[PDB]
């Protein structure tokens, strides 16, 4: 009874200590030492391609490391692998469950992962011995819906779930190698670092966490937002990341400074952010919104310098190619577009 | 050189030939979201009609797939957005067992006023009418003990009841139906309709009710195309 209040008082004392430390390490705003560099001007991206063939809304999408092939997951039950240069469909996999919410493409191009409301992550082999595309594995063991998944290699995979936990699985064996606990809400997204040592995860508790893959413990916690976090993405060098939330605001956090540096918001933006991504240099930050549009932000100057308006329904997913040559956007109107 | 490209084109042609057969099947089926309030008899209604369970039934050669979420948490503001294109949400409410009736009212108010579920229609099944009748005659628990405006409520004129029930059970049932219809009637922001029904465990004609309500939903959906 009283010991619980003792523990709460200790926790609030530690919170005050951490906040005062943060305030001590904050000497000059990013928006002050960036006031001299020249603006990027204006970005004018146009719809080069438009991929058709999905029946329902598209939830997920992921580029390949060869920068040419693309994957998309639709709520009709289709996992379609497109060739983006020629607009040809390379594969069309039918799923056992229609409620897929995430999809991932292996960095080797051999496997594809997908999960959803069935709490299972299915791994499909794309290079079977002169045969079809078949379910290579089915990783089960989560308690809530599977919201995100990312390959580390052809054998390891990290998945976020709606049961407030992340998991690192060995695909060959089939059981969880590591479990990352600590979030109090549905983990909505995860982002791998340039190196495969760390990864950030955002949840509905308006906080993001940094997890070490090898050890399995949480390093840092970031609490700048004030509503559910939907998107997360690492800065190209891995020393910072960016998040988007339902409070209609994107934010940039640093790993070594352990606090937020920039806030991207505007007065007429009152819709949440569904997806964020960085360009190859890290100067531009693309963010999809509920108002059917995508905004391009100057990551250093915090001024918006472009719009992407080609979708008729909510922009659900968004991804920049590994060579920085194109931006694929998928929306609930069942169309994938490529911008350049 | 060009042989690889034409092989790619042939693979794409076969993929699209299969996608057409899949598209003809995706349009013939109607998906429903069975979203009960818990302890409301939705299990008995799916008896009648691990992450998510699915039940297929067929009425007049029309196929319906009804989904019930299983191993999920009690926070549902993130996975419910998946069901914005479902033709109908079947909302089961334990009319006798409750404060679970206020919980059901608040859940229906959240669904009705959600930004993405604003064009989705709700078929409202007020289950547990037998226990409601026995509890209104027995007088064990009153709705006035949880809904003080139950007094001074006069039963409306239309919708004659079946003879075997006491008029006070009619008053209670229609008071709960009006509690739901106030929420259904008031917001006006998005297009969608509510279809309140009375069900039971001994009932056997719920599939035709869902059939007729979905027929009306699809009729009103086709009707909008003509304007604007």
């Amino acid at each position, epitope marked *: 009874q009283s010991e619980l209040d003792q523990l709460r008082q200790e926790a609030e004392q530690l919170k005050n200590q951490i906040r005062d430390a943060r305030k001590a390490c904050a000497d000059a705003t990013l928006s002050q030492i960036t006031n001299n560099i020249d603006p990027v001007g204006r970005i004018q991206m146009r719809t080069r391609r438009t991929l058709r063939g999905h029946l329902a809304k598209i939830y997920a999408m992921h580029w390949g490391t060869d920068s040419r092939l693309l994957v998309s997951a639709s709520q009709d039950g289709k996992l379609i692998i497109w060739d983006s240069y020629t607009t040809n469909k390379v594969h069309a996999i039918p799923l056992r469950s229609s409620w897929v919410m995430t999809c991932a493409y292996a960095p080797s191009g051999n496997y594809v992962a997908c999960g959803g409301l069935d709490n299972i992550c299915s791994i499909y082999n794309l290079k079977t011995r002169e045969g079809n595309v078949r379910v290579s594995r089915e990783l089960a063991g989560h308690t809530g819906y599977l919201s995100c998944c990312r390959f580390l290699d052809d054998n390891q995979i990290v998945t976020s779930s709606g049961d407030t936990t992340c998991a690192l699985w060995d695909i060959e064996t089939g059981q969880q190698t590591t479990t990352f606990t600590g979030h109090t809400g549905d983990v909505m997204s995860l982002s791998l670092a340039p190196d495969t040592r760390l990864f950030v995860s955002g949840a509905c508790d308006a906080s993001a966490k940094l997890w070490d893959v090898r050890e399995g413990m949480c390093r840092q916690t970031f609490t700048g937002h004030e*509503s*559910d976090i939907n998107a997360i993405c690492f800065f190209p060098n891995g020393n910072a990341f960016a998040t988007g939330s339902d*409070d209609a605001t994107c934010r940039l956090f640093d790993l070594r400074a352990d606090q937020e540096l920039m806030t991207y918001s505007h007065d007429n933006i009152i819709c949440g952010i569904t997806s964020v991504s960085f360009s190859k240099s890290g100067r531009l930050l693309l963010a999809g919104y509920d108002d059917f549009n995508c905004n391009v932000w100057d990551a250093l100057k915090a001024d918006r310098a472009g719009v992407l308006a080609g979708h008729d329904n909510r922009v659900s997913c968004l991804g920049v190619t590994d060579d920085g040559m194109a931006v694929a956007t998928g929306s609930w109107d069942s169309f994938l577009k490529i911008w350049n | 050189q060009r042989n690889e490209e034409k092989a790619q084109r042939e693979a794409n042609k076969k993929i699209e030939k299969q996608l057409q057969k899949d598209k003809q099947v995706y349009r013939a089926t109607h998906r429903l979201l069975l979203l009960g309030a818990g302890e409301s008899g939705k299990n008995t209604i799916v008896k009648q009609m691990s992450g998510i369970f699915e039940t297929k039934f067929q009425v007049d050669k029309v196929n319906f797939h009804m989904f019930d979420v299983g191993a999920q948490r*009690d926070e549902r503001r993130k996975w419910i957005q998946c069901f914005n294109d479902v033709t109908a949400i079947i909302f089961v409410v334990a009319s006798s067992s409750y*404060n679970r009736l206020q*919980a059901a009212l608040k859940l229906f108010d959240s669904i009705w006023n959600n930004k993405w579920l604003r064009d989705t229609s709700v078929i409202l099944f007020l289950n547990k009418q037998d226990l409601l009748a026995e509890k209104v005659l027995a007088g064990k628990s009153k709705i006035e003990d949880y809904f003080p405006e139950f007094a001074r409520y006069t039963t409306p004129e239309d919708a004659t009841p079946e003879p075997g029930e006491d008029p006070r059970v009619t008053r209670a049932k229609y008071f709960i139906r009006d509690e739901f219809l106030r929420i259904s009637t008031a917001s006006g922001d998005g297009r969608h309709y509510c279809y309140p029904h009375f069900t039971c465990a001994v009932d056997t004609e719920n599939i035709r009710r869902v059939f007729n309500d979905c027929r009306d939903i699809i009729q009103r959906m086709h009707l909008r195309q003509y304007e604007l």
Partner: nanobody
Framework: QVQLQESGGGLVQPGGSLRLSCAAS????????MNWVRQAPGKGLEWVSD????????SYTGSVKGRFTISRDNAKNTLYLQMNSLKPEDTAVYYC?????????????????????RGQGTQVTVSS
């Protein structure tokens, strides 16, 4: 951090009056619809009252309608619940919940036993 701190609880003889306060920090108080919920000893969380962004739309539950009155002061980001004519069946832990998203008109999961935008709660005891 989104912080909601409640105050004003205590033991009151049946028929007395209380006034619970809820101080908010870490978000724009005037963009969210606020709620008062409670948990009775041995029961689950139940919704008691709610008030919209401005204060024009107000709703209560059947048990407290007529006795309680909720208000919000946006100038100091504070929520108030004045409880009048308390009875022994009002003893519970009271929580101050925030609606999950801004500018919306619907609040889904304020009574989920794990909701992240709640407070710690004040114990209101009614006895002689």
């Amino acid at each position: 951090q989104v912080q909601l701190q409640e105050s004003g609880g205590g033991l009151v003889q049946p028929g007395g009056s209380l006034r619970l306060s809820c101080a908010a920090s870490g978000f724009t108080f005037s963009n969210y619809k606020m709620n008062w919920v409670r948990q009775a000893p041995g029961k689950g969380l139940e919704w008691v009252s709610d008030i919209s962004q401005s204060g024009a739309s107000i709703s209560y539950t059947g048990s407290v309608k007529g006795r309680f009155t909720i208000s919000r002061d946006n100038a100091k980001n504070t929520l108030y619940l004045q409880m009048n004519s308390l009875k022994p069946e009002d003893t519970a832990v009271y929580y101050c919940a925030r609606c999950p998203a801004p500018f919306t008109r619907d609040c889904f999961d304020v009574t989920s036993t794990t909701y992240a935008y709640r407070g710690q709660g004040t114990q209101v005891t009614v006895s002689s």
